[PDB]
Every structure is written in structure tokens, then in C-alpha cells.
Amino acid sequence: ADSYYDYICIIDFEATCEEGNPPEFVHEIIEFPVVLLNTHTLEIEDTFQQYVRPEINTQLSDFCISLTGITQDQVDRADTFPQVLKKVIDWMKLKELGTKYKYSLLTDGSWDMSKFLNIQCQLSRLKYPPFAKKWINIRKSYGNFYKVPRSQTKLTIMLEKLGMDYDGRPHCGLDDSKNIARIAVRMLQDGCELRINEKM
Ligand SMILES: Nc1ncnc2c1ncn2[C@@H]1O[C@H](COP(=O)(O)O)[C@@H](O)[C@H]1O
Ligand SMILES: [Mg+2]
Ligand SMILES: [Mg+2]
């Protein structure tokens, strides 16, 4: 398996939303998961998961709660986005990412990590983190490696094509991140050289 990176960090956010995806509703991140994939052992070595308390639209819609399974009380008890991002940065530093170990972020598309983070950093008046400015977009990697159209790189289809079931609850951010990590593991086992393929 490709050992170009020592670790791959999979991040797939959940955000506030309304039914019908209205463009005037401003998204806030409500779940910040990180799955740490060891490229040498091909094991998920560790995970990070925190909910995040939205401030612009504090009350989750019924649609959002139904979609993600995240409840109002779970976000009520959560820390602010700046506090959660601080914890993520600490955790990554603890894992020695970017110092002892070479690493990349891996995502399920541009929206699913970068655009939500971009919106949220605007809202929180934070710099968009340089470490998140490039990533492996696994839909692009999968499409190019298995030679399938974009229509066939939906998360459930990627799993099904490879003889895998979805493990856990779809639209739980940590569970989606884990399933994306499972696909990445199989791609590495299959001989794919996963590489950064998208920049902001
Ligand atoms: N069907 C949908 N309708 C409205 N928003 C959605 C829908 N699917 C996903 N989203 C939004 O996009 C986020 C990430 O999607 P996902 O990674 O599939 O859970 C969700 O947390 C929602 O904010
Ligand atoms: Mg996603
Ligand atoms: Mg998700």
C-alpha cells in the first residue's frame, strides 16, 4: 500500500440545514469529526468527535435533527466553533501531524469539508486554516482510479461497488468519516496512490 503519507485525516462535517436547502439559510458546523488513518497499518488509529453549538441559527430544524440525528440538547451542551477548532488543532499537534509525520486531509467532496469550513471561518472571524487548503477529494480519486462517472461516486455506491455495506448511521459525521476512511483503506489495498487533488 502507498506509504507517501504516514497518516490521512478524514473529516466530514455535519451542519445546520433546512428542508429544501434554501440558499438564504447560513450553514454552521454542528459536528467536527476527525478519523486518523495510519497508512502503514491501514488501521483507524484514533478518532476525534465534538459537537459544535451554532450561534447564528441556534435552534436546529426538525429536518436537521432527523437527517443527522444530532439533537438540540447535544448542540446546546457543546462548545463554540472557535473552541472546537482549537481542540482539533491541539489533537493534530498531539498526533505530531506535520512535524514527525507527513499527512493529508481526505474528504468526500468540496462541500463536505472545505466549503462548510470556509463558511464557518467567515462567520467566526477566524482564518481559514492553511492545513485545510488542499486535500484528497476521494470522489475524484475513486472516479479516476476505478474509471466511473461522478454519478457513481456517491458514498453508498462507492461502498456497494467494492462489496461493502455502510457501517453505522448515515449523516452522523463520525460514521460518515469512518466509512470514507474504509473506502480509502480499500483503495490503498487495491494499489491506488492517493494524492492531493483539490486546492481551495
Ligand atoms: N438532503 C439534504 N437536504 C438539506 N441539507 C442537506 C441534505 N443532505 C446533506 N445536507 C447538508 O449537508 C451536510 C453534510 O451532508 P452529509 O455529509 O451527507 O451528512 C448536512 O449536515 C446538511 O447540513
Ligand atoms: Mg459529508
Ligand atoms: Mg456527513
**Known catalytic membership, residue 171:** yes
Q: Ligand 1, residue 16: give the atom nearest the CA.
A: 23
- CB count within 10 Å of CB 180 equals 26
Q: Is residue 109 left, alpha or beta, with left meaning phi > 0 and alpha meaning psi from -120 to 50? A: left
CA distances from 52 to 17, 156, 198 (A): 14, 26, 26
Cα 185 to middle of ligand 1, angstroms: 24
CA 184, CA 200: separation in Å to the nearest integer? Answer: 21
Cα 184 to middle of ligand 3, angstroms: 16
| Structural domains of the chain, with CATH | 1-199 (3.30.420.10)
Per-position DSSP letters for 121-181, written without gaps between them: HHHHT-PPPGGGSEEEEHHHHHHHHHT--GGG-SHHHHHHHTT----S-TT-HHHHHHHHH
CA 32, CA 30: separation in Å to the nearest integer? Answer: 7
Nominal resolution (angstroms): 1.6
Structure-solving method: X-ray
Residue 68 in grid coordinates: 443527522
> Of residues 96, 171, 193, 198, which has the active-site annotation?
171
Take atom 10 of ligand 1 and give the residue whose Cα is closest.
Answer: 17
List, in sequence order, every residue forming a beta bridge with 49; answer none if it has no partner: 33
CA 107, CA 156: separation in Å to the nearest integer? Answer: 15
Residue 84 in grid coordinates: 472546537
CA angle 51, 128, 31 (to 5 degrees): 10
The residue type of 79 is D
Ligand 1 neighbours (beta carbon < 6 A) = 12, 14-15, 17, 21, 67-68, 112, 171, 176
